[PDB]
C-alpha cells in the first residue's frame, strides 16, 4: 500500500474527504494489481 | 552502362535503395567517371537547390525533377558515400557544386519554424553534417572552400543569435580532429562490411583513425630483432617513423604526385631485422586553422576554474594574429575552447604574452595590435583582475600566485615586446590609463614583503620604454633605492643585481 | 453515516460538514449556537457504537470575509438560482463564442465546481432541484467536459476534475427516478478512449485511468473491449528502427534516446528480475514533467544531526541550466539514536518558489515524520503540510497540492521508533518538485520578472539544450556504429572500456533528453499562460492517424497504463468467470 | 567440453568457490557439541 499521509493544510478546505477517497482509489488500485500478480489461473 | 538504361538514365524516380545501390557501385574510378559524365549528379543537385529556393521562398511569404522533404536525406546520404572518390571531391570543390552549399545552409539556418517537422529536420542536419564532415577530408582545396563559405555566412550574420545548426557545426565539425582512413596490406595476420579494394580476412586492415595520432600506436593497436617497418607504394627503399603523424604523411604524399581527396591510404607492413627530412616536414594545415587563417575567431567572437579567465578568452582571440599563435598547441586549445562552450586557465594568458613577444614595435602589427587592445578594453580587464587577484584597488584621484604571475608576465610583454622611435611607439593614453589603476599600490604592497624575476622583467620592461618612465615616481623613498634594500637584505643573483643597477640608473 | 469519512487504515477519519440550508438560514443573521447527535444504530469491552470511539476533535473553520458587502444573497443566488450551474458547464464546454476560454479560467470554474459539490454534498431535506440541474447538466456534456479536462489540460486541471467528478460519484443520493453518475460517468470515459493516444500529459491521463478503474465496477464489457481494441491498435502500431533493438539486446537499454519527446517520468521511494514472479504503488508520482526539481541548502541542523550527500550569454543559458538540474542524493545521519529520538532540519530553496510534489523514502528505524513550510518567519506565516506516523511501513508521497502552496523555507522535524537500536541509519532527504517561475495568480494567494523575458530565456535554454541532445545523439550514433556486429546470430550478444563508454553517453543522452522534455513542457506552460491553447482535439480527427502520428515514448505509457487496468479488470471478477467479449477479441492470432 | 551458450545463458539464472556453509553437518556418534561451526 501507500503511506496513511494526507495534506493538513488543505484541511481548511472542504475537499479533505476527496483526498482521501482518491487516495484509496489509489491504494485498492495497488493492492488489486499486486493481487492480480500474485495469483495464478485456476 | 546497362544498369545506367534501367533507371531511366541515357521524369525521373528513385528511391533510398536505388541511390543506395548507386551510391554503393560508384566507389571504383571507371564507374565514377561514368556517373560524373551522367547527368544524374547535374539534375539532383539542380532539384535540391530548386527544392530549397522554394522553401525558402514559402518560409518567407507568410533537366528538374521534383524533390520532396523526405527523399532528400537519403539522397544527401548518396552524396556523403559517392563522396570517397577523389574525382567527387574535385567536383563538389566546383563552383558547379557551391549552390548545394549555399542553398542548404540558408535552408536551414534561415528559414526557420510547406512544413519541416523536427525529425526530418534532425535528418537533414545530420546528412549536412555527414557531407560536410566527408568534403573537407583531406582535400585542403575545400577546406579553404569551406572556410570561406563559413566565414562569409558569419560575416553577414543579421544583427544577433545564432541559429543551431551554425553554433553545432562550429562545436562539431572544426572542434574535432580530422579523421582519415588507414589502409594496411601484410602477409602476416593482424589482430563489418567495406569496399572490395580493402580486402577481406585479417591479413587486410582498414581503420578510421583520427590524423592527431603517429604511426607507433595505430601499429600497437595491430641480437637480432624482427621489427614491423611500414612503406608506402610511391617510395621505394625507405622505411617510415614510428613517430612519424600522419599528417606528415599526408604532406610528404600530397606532395609526391597522390591525387587530392584520395580518402585511404594504404601502407604495406613488412618484417625487418634490427640489431640491439621525414619528421621535419611541415603537417597538414586543417580546417580549423585554414578558417582561422582569415580571422573568422574574431567574427565568431563578434556573434557571441576561474570563470574570468574563460570570459576574457574570448575577448583576447578577437584581435587578428591571436589564432595563428594559438594553434601552436592543438590538444590544448581544444580544451579550452571545450570549456568555453560549455594549465588551462594560464593558456589564455600565456597565448597573449607569445603574441605580445612575437610581434614587435618596430612593425605595425604590433602598434595595430597595441592600438585594438586599447580600444576594445583588454587592459581594463586584467587591470581589474589582478586589483581582484591582489586585493588592492586603483588610486581613486596557490593559483592566484599564478594568476598574478601570468599577468604581470602579460603586463611585461606588453610594455616591452623584445623583452620576452621608442619613445612615440606607444601613445600616452596608455601612460595616463596606468596612471590610475592598481599598478603601484600592489607593487609596493608585494615588493616591502621565478615571480620575483617576472617582477624584475617588468621593471626593465618599464624601464626600457622612455615615455613609460614617469609612473616610477611614487606620490618618499625611490623604488630604486628601495630594491637596493631588499636586493642587499635577499643577498639568480646576477638577474637581481642586474635589475636592480637597472631601475638605479632609471630612477637617476 | 461513519463510512463517508473513514480514513485509509480504518481506525480514523474525519468529516466536513456544512450545508446550503446552514448559510441560507445564517443568511437571517440569528442562529448563533448548534448541536450534535453520537447515535449508534441498529438493525472483554463489548462496546457498541458511540462506545466504540476512542478520541474526538471538534474544530470550526469560518468563512473568508472579502471586500465584496451584501455576500449573503450572492452566495444564496447559485444555491437558489441554477441557471450559473449551466453556465459553468458551459464554460468547460467552449461553446461560447465570447472569445476563446484560456486554462486560468477553466482553473477558476473548476474551483467553484469543486466547491459547490462539496457544499452539496450533504442536503438535508432540502430541495434538490438545482442539484438535480447541475446533475444532469453535468451528464448532459460529460463526453465534453472529461475531453477539455482529460485530455487538453495539464496535472492541475485534471486533477481538479477527477477530484469533482469523484465527488459527484461519492454524494450519489439520487432519487429513483435519477440514474446514478456511475452509468453515465463510466459511458463518457469509454467515449474517449480514442483521442487518448493525442493527449497532453501524463498525470491527466492518470487521473483518467484511475477514474476509470474505479468506475468500471458497474459495468464491464464497454471497457474490455475498448482497451482491447486500443491494445491492438498501438501494439501493431509501435512496432514500427535497428538502433534501440541493439541497445535492448547489448545492454538492456530501453528508453529510446533518439526520440526528443516523452510523455512523463514515473518516480518512487519504494529490468526486473523474473524469479519472485516465476511496483505496484510506482505509479504514486505521475507527470514530473510539467514539474521541475528544485535545490536545497541546508541552514538549521539540531543536535546530533547531520546533512550530508551520498555517493555572455551561453554562460546565463549555462547557469540557467544548472538551476534546472535534478541534485544529486543527499541523506541525514545521527549521532545518538534513542526511542523517540527529536530531531529537526531546515532547508532552504533560495527564493520564494511554488511546492507541488514531495518525496520521502522509506525509512525503517523512524516512527514520524512532519514537514513545515514558512516563506517569511515560522510564526509569521507557517502552515503544516503532512505529519506521516508510518515511515517504516510504506514512504511518504504527496503528489499534486492544489491550490499550489508558495514557500522559501522547510522544516523537517523527525521523531525515531520506540526501542529504536543504537545502529547508524541514513534519512534522505528525497525529492523535491515545483515550480521555477511563479505565476501572478499563483503568487496573489499568499522583483518579479515579466512573463516575456522568462519565456524568452526559457526557449533560448530550450535550443542549446536542443542543441547539447543532438550532439550527444550524434556522438552516440558514431561511437555505436563501432560495435561488433558478428555474424554469430544473437548468442554471443548475450555473452570493457568500450560498455562501459557506451552507458556513459547513453546516460548523458537521456539526461539532455529528459531536460529537453521538461523545458519544452515549461516554455508550453508559459505560452498557455500567455492566453495561447495546446492541441485542440478536432472531431474530424481520424482515431487511426492520431495513433500513428502519437510519440513512441506515450505509446509505450498508454500500453503500460492501460494494459494495467486490463490486468485489474480480470481481477475483478473475484475468481468467477471472465466474459466472453475479451476473451474473444483475443483469439489465437491476435495473442500472437 | 567447452562452455556453450547454454551454460551463459543458464549462469545468471540461478576461480574455486567454498560449498561448506551451504551444506549441513552430522556426526555417527553423539557429541558434546554440534560441528556446524566448522562450516
Same mark, same amino acid.
Given at each position: 500500500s501507500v503511506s496513511q499521509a494526507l495534506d493538513?493544510?488543505?484541511?481548511?478546505?472542504?475537499?479533505q474527504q476527496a483526498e482521501l477517497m482518491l487516495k484509496m482509489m489509489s491504494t485498492l488500485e495497488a493492492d488489486s494489481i499486486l493481487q492480480a500478480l500474485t495469483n495464478t489461473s485456476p | 552502362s546497362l544498369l545506367m538504361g534501367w533507371? =531511366?538514365?541515357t521524369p525521373l524516380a528513385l528511391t533510398e535503395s536505388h541511390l543506395a545501390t548507386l551510391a554503393s557501385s560508384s566507389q571504383s574510378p571507371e564507374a565514377i567517371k561514368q556517373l560524373l559524365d551522367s547527368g544524374l549528379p547535374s539534375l539532383l543537385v539542380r532539384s535540391l537547390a530548386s527544392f530549397c529556393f522554394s522553401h525558402i521562398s514559402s518560409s518567407e511569404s507568410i533537366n528538374k525533377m521534383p524533390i520532396t522533404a523526405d527523399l532528400v536525406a537519403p539522397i544527401l546520404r548518396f552524396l556523403t558515400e559517392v563522396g570517397n572518390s577523389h574525382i567527387m571531391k574535385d567536383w563538389l570543390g566546383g563552383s558547379e557544386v557551391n549552390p548545394l552549399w549555399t542553398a542548404l545552409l540558408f535552408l536551414l539556418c534561415?528559414? =526557420?519554424?510547406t512544413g519541416l517537422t523536427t525529425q526530418q529536420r534532425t535528418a537533414i542536419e545530420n546528412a549536412t553534417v555527414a557531407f560536410f564532415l566527408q568534403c573537407i577530408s583531406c582535400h585542403p582545396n575545400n577546406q579553404k572552400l569551406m572556410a570561406q563559405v563559413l566565414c562569409e555566412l558569419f560575416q553577414t550574420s543579421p544583427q544577433g543569435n545564432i541559429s543551431g545548426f551554425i553554433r553545432r557545426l562550429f562545436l562539431q565539425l572544426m572542434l574535432e580532429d580530422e579523421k582519415v582512413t588507414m589502409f594496411l596490406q601484410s602477409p602476416c595476420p593482424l589482430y563489418v562490411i567495406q569496399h572490395p579494394?580493402? =580486402?577481406? =580476412?585479417?591479413?587486410f586492415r582498414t581503420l578510421h583513425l %583520427?590524423?592527431? !595520432?603517429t604511426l607507433s600506436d595505430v601499429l600497437d593497436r595491430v641480437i637480432t630483432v624482427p621489427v614491423f617497418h611500414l612503406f608506402h607504394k610511391?617510395?621505394?627503399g625507405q622505411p617510415l617513423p614510428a613517430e612519424m603523424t600522419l599528417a606528415q604523411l599526408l604532406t610528404l604524399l600530397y606532395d609526391r604526385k597522390?591525387?587530392?581527396?584520395?580518402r585511404s591510404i594504404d601502407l604495406t607492413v613488412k618484417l625487418g631485422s634490427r640489431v640491439i627530412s621525414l619528421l621535419e616536414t611541415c603537417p597538414i594545415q586543417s580546417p580549423l586553422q585554414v578558417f582561422a587563417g582569415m580571422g573568422g575567431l574574431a567574427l565568431i567572437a563578434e556573434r557571441l576554474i576561474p570563470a574570468h579567465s574563460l570570459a576574457a578568452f574570448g575577448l583576447f582571440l578577437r584581435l587578428p594574429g591571436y589564432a595563428e599563435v594559438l594553434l601552436k598547441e592543438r590538444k590544448h586549445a581544444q580544451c579550452l575552447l571545450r570549456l568555453v562552450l560549455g594549465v588551462l586557465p594560464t593558456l589564455p594568458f600565456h597565448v597573449l604574452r607569445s603574441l605580445f613577444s612575437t610581434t614587435?614595435? !618596430? !612593425?605595425?602589427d604590433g602598434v595595430l595590435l597595441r592600438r585594438m587592445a586599447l580600444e576594445i578594453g583588454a587592459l581594463h580587464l586584467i587591470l581589474v583582475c589582478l586589483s581582484a587577484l591582489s586585493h588592492h584597488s586603483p588610486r581613486v584621484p596557490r593559483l592566484e600566485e599564478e594568476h598574478v604571475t601570468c599577468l604581470l608576465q602579460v603586463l611585461a610583454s606588453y610594455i616591452n %615586446?623584445?623583452?620576452?622611435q621608442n619613445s612615440n611607439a606607444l601613445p600616452s593614453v596608455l601612460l595616463e590609463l596606468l596612471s590610475q589603476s592598481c599598478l603601484i599600490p600592489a607593487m609596493s604592497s608585494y615588493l616591502r614583503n621565478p615571480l620575483y624575476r617576472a617582477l624584475l622583467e617588468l621593471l626593465r620592461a618599464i624601464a626600457s620604454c622612455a615615455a613609460m618612465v614617469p609612473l616610477l615616481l611614487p606620490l618618499q623613498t625611490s623604488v630604486g633605492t628601495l630594491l637596493a634594500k631588499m636586493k642587499t637584505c635577499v643577498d639568480l643573483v646576477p638577474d637581481i643585481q642586474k635589475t636592480a643597477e637597472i631601475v638605479y640608473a632609471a630612477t637617476t | 453515516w461513519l463510512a463517508s469519512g473513514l480514513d485509509l487504515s480504518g481506525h480514523a477519519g474525519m468529516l466536513t460538514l456544512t450545508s446550503p440550508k446552514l448559510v441560507k438560514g445564517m443568511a437571517g443573521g440569528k442562529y448563533r449556537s448548534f448541536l450534535i447527535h453520537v447515535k449508534a444504530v441498529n438493525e472483554s469491552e463489548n462496546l457498541r457504537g458511540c462506545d466504540l470511539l476512542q478520541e474526538v476533535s471538534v474544530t470550526i473553520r469560518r468563512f473568508k470575509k472579502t471586500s465584496?458587502?451584501?455576500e449573503r444573497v450572492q452566495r444564496c443566488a447559485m444555491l437558489q438560482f441554477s441557471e450559473f450551474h449551466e453556465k459553468l458547464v458551459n464554460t468547460l464546454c467552449?461553446?461560447?463564442?465570447?472569445?476563446q476560454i484560456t486554462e486560468h479560467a477553466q482553473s477558476l470554474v473548476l474551483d467553484t465546481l469543486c466547491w459547490l459539490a462539496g457544499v452539496h454534498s450533504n442536503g438535508p431535506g432540502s430541495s434538490k432541484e438545482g442539484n438535480e440541474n447541475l446533475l444532469s447538466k453535468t451528464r448532459k456534456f460529460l463526453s465534453d467536459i472529461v475531453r477539455v479536462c482529460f &485530455?487538453?489540460?495539464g496535472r492541475s486541471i485534471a486533477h481538479k476534475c477527477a477530484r469533482f467528478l469523484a465527488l459527484c460519484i461519492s454524494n450519489?443520493?439520487?432519487? *429513483?427516478?435519477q440514474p446514478a453518475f456511475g452509468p453515465v460517468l463510466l459511458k463518457a470515459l469509454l467515449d474517449n478512449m480514442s483521442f487518448l493516444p493525442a493527449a497532453t500529459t501524463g498525470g491527466s491521463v492518470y487521473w483518467y485511468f484511475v477514474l476509470l478503474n474505479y468506475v468500471k465496477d458497474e459495468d464491464l464489457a464497454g471497457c474490455s473491449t475498448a482497451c482491447a481494441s486500443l491494445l491492438t491498435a498501438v501494439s501493431r502500431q509501435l512496432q514500427d528502427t535497428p538502433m534501440e533493438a541493439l541497445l535492448q539486446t547489448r545492454?538492456?537499454?530501453?528508453?529510446? *534516446?533518439?526520440? *526528443?519527446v516523452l510523455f512523463d517520468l514515473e518516480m518512487s521511494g519504494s529490468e526486473i528480475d523474473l524469479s519472485d514472479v516465476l511496483?505496484?504503488? &510506482?505509479?504514486?508520482?505521475?507527470?514530473?514533467?510539467?514539474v521541475e526539481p528544485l535545490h536545497f541548502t541546508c541552514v538549521s541542523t539540531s543536535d546530533g544531526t547531520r546533512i550530508e550527500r551520498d555517493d555572455g550569454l551561453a554562460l546565463a543559458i549555462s547557469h540557467a541550466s544548472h538551476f534546472l538540474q535534478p541534485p544529486p542524493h543527499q541523506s541525514i545521519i545521527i549521532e545518538r539514536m534513542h526511542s523517540g529520538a527529536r530531531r529537526f532540519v531546515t532547508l532552504d530553496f533560495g527564493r520564494p518558489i511554488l511546492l507541488t510534489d514531495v518525496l520521502i523514502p522509506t525509512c525503517g528505524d523512524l516512527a514520524s515524520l512532519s514537514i513545515d513550510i514558512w516563506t517569511l518567519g515560522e510564526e509569521v506565516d507557517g502552515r503544516r503540510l503532512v505529519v506521516a506516523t508510518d515511515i517504516s511501513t510504506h514512504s511518504l508521497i504527496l503528489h499534486d497540492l492544489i491550490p499550489p502552496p508558495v514557500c522559501r523555507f522547510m522544516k523537517i522535524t523527525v521523531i525515531g521508533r520506540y526501542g529504536s537500536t543504537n545502529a547508524r541509519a541514513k534519512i534522505p532527504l528525497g525529492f523535491y518538485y515545483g515550480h521555477t517561475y511563479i505565476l501572478p495568480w499563483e503568487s496573489e494567494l499568499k522583483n518579479q520578472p515579466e512573463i516575456d523575458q522568462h519565456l524568452a530565456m526559457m526557449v533560448a535554454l530550450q535550443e542549446d539544450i536542443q542543441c547539447r541532445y543532438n550532439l550527444a545523439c550524434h556522438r552516440l550514433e558514431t561511437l555505436l556504429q563501432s560495435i561488433d556486429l558478428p555474424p554469430l546470430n544473437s548468442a554471443n550478444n548475450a555473452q570493457v572500456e568500450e560498455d562501459s563508454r557506451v552507458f556513459s553517453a547513453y546516460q548523458d543522452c537521456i539526461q539532455l533528453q529528459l531536460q529537453l522534455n521538461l523545458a519544452h513542457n515549461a516554455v508550453q506552460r508559459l505560452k498557455v499562460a500567455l492566453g495561447a491553447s495546446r492541441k485542440m482535439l478536432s472531431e474530424t480527427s481520424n482515431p487511426e492517424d492520431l495513433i500513428q502520428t502519437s510519440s513512441t515514448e506515450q505509446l509505450r505509457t498508454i500500453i503500460r497504463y492501460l494494459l494495467d487496468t486490463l490486468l485489474s479488470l480480470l481481477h475483478a471478477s473475484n475468481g468467477h468467470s471472465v466474459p466472453a467479449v475479451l476473451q474473444s477479441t483475443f483469439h489465437a492470432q491476435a495473442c500472437e | 567440453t567447452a562452455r556453450s551458450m547454454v551454460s551463459t545463458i543458464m549462469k545468471f539464472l540461478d576461480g574455486i568457490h567454498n560449498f561448506a556453509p551451504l551444506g549441513t553437518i552430522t556426526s555417527s556418534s553423539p557429541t558434546a557439541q554440534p560441528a556446524e561451526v566448522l562450516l
Amino acid at each position: 500500500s501507500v503511506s496513511q499521509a494526507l495534506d493538513a493544510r488543505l484541511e481548511v478546505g472542504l475537499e479533505q474527504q476527496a483526498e482521501l477517497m482518491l487516495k484509496m482509489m489509489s491504494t485498492l488500485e495497488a493492492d488489486s494489481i499486486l493481487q492480480a500478480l500474485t495469483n495464478t489461473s485456476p | 552502362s546497362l544498369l545506367m538504361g534501367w533507371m =531511366g538514365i541515357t521524369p525521373l524516380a528513385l528511391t533510398e535503395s536505388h541511390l543506395a545501390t548507386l551510391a554503393s557501385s560508384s566507389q571504383s574510378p571507371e564507374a565514377i567517371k561514368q556517373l560524373l559524365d551522367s547527368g544524374l549528379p547535374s539534375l539532383l543537385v539542380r532539384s535540391l537547390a530548386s527544392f530549397c529556393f522554394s522553401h525558402i521562398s514559402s518560409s518567407e511569404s507568410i533537366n528538374k525533377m521534383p524533390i520532396t522533404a523526405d527523399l532528400v536525406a537519403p539522397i544527401l546520404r548518396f552524396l556523403t558515400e559517392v563522396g570517397n572518390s577523389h574525382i567527387m571531391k574535385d567536383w563538389l570543390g566546383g563552383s558547379e557544386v557551391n549552390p548545394l552549399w549555399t542553398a542548404l545552409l540558408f535552408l536551414l539556418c534561415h528559414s =526557420g519554424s510547406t512544413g519541416l517537422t523536427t525529425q526530418q529536420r534532425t535528418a537533414i542536419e545530420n546528412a549536412t553534417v555527414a557531407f560536410f564532415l566527408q568534403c573537407i577530408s583531406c582535400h585542403p582545396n575545400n577546406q579553404k572552400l569551406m572556410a570561406q563559405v563559413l566565414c562569409e555566412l558569419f560575416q553577414t550574420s543579421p544583427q544577433g543569435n545564432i541559429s543551431g545548426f551554425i553554433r553545432r557545426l562550429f562545436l562539431q565539425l572544426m572542434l574535432e580532429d580530422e579523421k582519415v582512413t588507414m589502409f594496411l596490406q601484410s602477409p602476416c595476420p593482424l589482430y563489418v562490411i567495406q569496399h572490395p579494394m580493402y =580486402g577481406a =580476412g585479417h591479413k587486410f586492415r582498414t581503420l578510421h583513425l %583520427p590524423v592527431s !595520432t603517429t604511426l607507433s600506436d595505430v601499429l600497437d593497436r595491430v641480437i637480432t630483432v624482427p621489427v614491423f617497418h611500414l612503406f608506402h607504394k610511391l617510395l621505394a627503399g625507405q622505411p617510415l617513423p614510428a613517430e612519424m603523424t600522419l599528417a606528415q604523411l599526408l604532406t610528404l604524399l600530397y606532395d609526391r604526385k597522390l591525387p587530392q581527396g584520395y580518402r585511404s591510404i594504404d601502407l604495406t607492413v613488412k618484417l625487418g631485422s634490427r640489431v640491439i627530412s621525414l619528421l621535419e616536414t611541415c603537417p597538414i594545415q586543417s580546417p580549423l586553422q585554414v578558417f582561422a587563417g582569415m580571422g573568422g575567431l574574431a567574427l565568431i567572437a563578434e556573434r557571441l576554474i576561474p570563470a574570468h579567465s574563460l570570459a576574457a578568452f574570448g575577448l583576447f582571440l578577437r584581435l587578428p594574429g591571436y589564432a595563428e599563435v594559438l594553434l601552436k598547441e592543438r590538444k590544448h586549445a581544444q580544451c579550452l575552447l571545450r570549456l568555453v562552450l560549455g594549465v588551462l586557465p594560464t593558456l589564455p594568458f600565456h597565448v597573449l604574452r607569445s603574441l605580445f613577444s612575437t610581434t614587435p614595435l !618596430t !612593425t605595425d602589427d604590433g602598434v595595430l595590435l597595441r592600438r585594438m587592445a586599447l580600444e576594445i578594453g583588454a587592459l581594463h580587464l586584467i587591470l581589474v583582475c589582478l586589483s581582484a587577484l591582489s586585493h588592492h584597488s586603483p588610486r581613486v584621484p596557490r593559483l592566484e600566485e599564478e594568476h598574478v604571475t601570468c599577468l604581470l608576465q602579460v603586463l611585461a610583454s606588453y610594455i616591452n %615586446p623584445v623583452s620576452s622611435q621608442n619613445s612615440n611607439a606607444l601613445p600616452s593614453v596608455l601612460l595616463e590609463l596606468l596612471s590610475q589603476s592598481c599598478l603601484i599600490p600592489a607593487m609596493s604592497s608585494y615588493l616591502r614583503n621565478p615571480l620575483y624575476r617576472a617582477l624584475l622583467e617588468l621593471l626593465r620592461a618599464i624601464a626600457s620604454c622612455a615615455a613609460m618612465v614617469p609612473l616610477l615616481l611614487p606620490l618618499q623613498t625611490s623604488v630604486g633605492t628601495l630594491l637596493a634594500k631588499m636586493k642587499t637584505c635577499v643577498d639568480l643573483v646576477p638577474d637581481i643585481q642586474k635589475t636592480a643597477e637597472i631601475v638605479y640608473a632609471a630612477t637617476t | 453515516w461513519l463510512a463517508s469519512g473513514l480514513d485509509l487504515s480504518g481506525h480514523a477519519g474525519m468529516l466536513t460538514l456544512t450545508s446550503p440550508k446552514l448559510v441560507k438560514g445564517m443568511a437571517g443573521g440569528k442562529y448563533r449556537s448548534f448541536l450534535i447527535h453520537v447515535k449508534a444504530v441498529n438493525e472483554s469491552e463489548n462496546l457498541r457504537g458511540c462506545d466504540l470511539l476512542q478520541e474526538v476533535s471538534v474544530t470550526i473553520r469560518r468563512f473568508k470575509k472579502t471586500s465584496i458587502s451584501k455576500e449573503r444573497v450572492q452566495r444564496c443566488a447559485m444555491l437558489q438560482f441554477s441557471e450559473f450551474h449551466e453556465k459553468l458547464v458551459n464554460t468547460l464546454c467552449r461553446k461560447t463564442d465570447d472569445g476563446q476560454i484560456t486554462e486560468h479560467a477553466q482553473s477558476l470554474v473548476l474551483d467553484t465546481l469543486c466547491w459547490l459539490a462539496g457544499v452539496h454534498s450533504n442536503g438535508p431535506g432540502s430541495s434538490k432541484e438545482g442539484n438535480e440541474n447541475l446533475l444532469s447538466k453535468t451528464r448532459k456534456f460529460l463526453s465534453d467536459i472529461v475531453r477539455v479536462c482529460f &485530455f487538453e489540460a495539464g496535472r492541475s486541471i485534471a486533477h481538479k476534475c477527477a477530484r469533482f467528478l469523484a465527488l459527484c460519484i461519492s454524494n450519489g443520493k439520487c432519487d *429513483p427516478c435519477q440514474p446514478a453518475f456511475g452509468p453515465v460517468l463510466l459511458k463518457a470515459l469509454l467515449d474517449n478512449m480514442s483521442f487518448l493516444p493525442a493527449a497532453t500529459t501524463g498525470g491527466s491521463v492518470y487521473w483518467y485511468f484511475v477514474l476509470l478503474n474505479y468506475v468500471k465496477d458497474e459495468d464491464l464489457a464497454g471497457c474490455s473491449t475498448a482497451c482491447a481494441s486500443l491494445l491492438t491498435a498501438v501494439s501493431r502500431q509501435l512496432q514500427d528502427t535497428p538502433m534501440e533493438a541493439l541497445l535492448q539486446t547489448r545492454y538492456g537499454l530501453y528508453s529510446s *534516446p533518439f526520440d *526528443p519527446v516523452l510523455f512523463d517520468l514515473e518516480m518512487s521511494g519504494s529490468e526486473i528480475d523474473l524469479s519472485d514472479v516465476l511496483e505496484g504503488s &510506482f505509479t504514486s508520482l505521475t507527470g514530473l514533467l510539467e514539474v521541475e526539481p528544485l535545490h536545497f541548502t541546508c541552514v538549521s541542523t539540531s543536535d546530533g544531526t547531520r546533512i550530508e550527500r551520498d555517493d555572455g550569454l551561453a554562460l546565463a543559458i549555462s547557469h540557467a541550466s544548472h538551476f534546472l538540474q535534478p541534485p544529486p542524493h543527499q541523506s541525514i545521519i545521527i549521532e545518538r539514536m534513542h526511542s523517540g529520538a527529536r530531531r529537526f532540519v531546515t532547508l532552504d530553496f533560495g527564493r520564494p518558489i511554488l511546492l507541488t510534489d514531495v518525496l520521502i523514502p522509506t525509512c525503517g528505524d523512524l516512527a514520524s515524520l512532519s514537514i513545515d513550510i514558512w516563506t517569511l518567519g515560522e510564526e509569521v506565516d507557517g502552515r503544516r503540510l503532512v505529519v506521516a506516523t508510518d515511515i517504516s511501513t510504506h514512504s511518504l508521497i504527496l503528489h499534486d497540492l492544489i491550490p499550489p502552496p508558495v514557500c522559501r523555507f522547510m522544516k523537517i522535524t523527525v521523531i525515531g521508533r520506540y526501542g529504536s537500536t543504537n545502529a547508524r541509519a541514513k534519512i534522505p532527504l528525497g525529492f523535491y518538485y515545483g515550480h521555477t517561475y511563479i505565476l501572478p495568480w499563483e503568487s496573489e494567494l499568499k522583483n518579479q520578472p515579466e512573463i516575456d523575458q522568462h519565456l524568452a530565456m526559457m526557449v533560448a535554454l530550450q535550443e542549446d539544450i536542443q542543441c547539447r541532445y543532438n550532439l550527444a545523439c550524434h556522438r552516440l550514433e558514431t561511437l555505436l556504429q563501432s560495435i561488433d556486429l558478428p555474424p554469430l546470430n544473437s548468442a554471443n550478444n548475450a555473452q570493457v572500456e568500450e560498455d562501459s563508454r557506451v552507458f556513459s553517453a547513453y546516460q548523458d543522452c537521456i539526461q539532455l533528453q529528459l531536460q529537453l522534455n521538461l523545458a519544452h513542457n515549461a516554455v508550453q506552460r508559459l505560452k498557455v499562460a500567455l492566453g495561447a491553447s495546446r492541441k485542440m482535439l478536432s472531431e474530424t480527427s481520424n482515431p487511426e492517424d492520431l495513433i500513428q502520428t502519437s510519440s513512441t515514448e506515450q505509446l509505450r505509457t498508454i500500453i503500460r497504463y492501460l494494459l494495467d487496468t486490463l490486468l485489474s479488470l480480470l481481477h475483478a471478477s473475484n475468481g468467477h468467470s471472465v466474459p466472453a467479449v475479451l476473451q474473444s477479441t483475443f483469439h489465437a492470432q491476435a495473442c500472437e | 567440453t567447452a562452455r556453450s551458450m547454454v551454460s551463459t545463458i543458464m549462469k545468471f539464472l540461478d576461480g574455486i568457490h567454498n560449498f561448506a556453509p551451504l551444506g549441513t553437518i552430522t556426526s555417527s556418534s553423539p557429541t558434546a557439541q554440534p560441528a556446524e561451526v566448522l562450516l
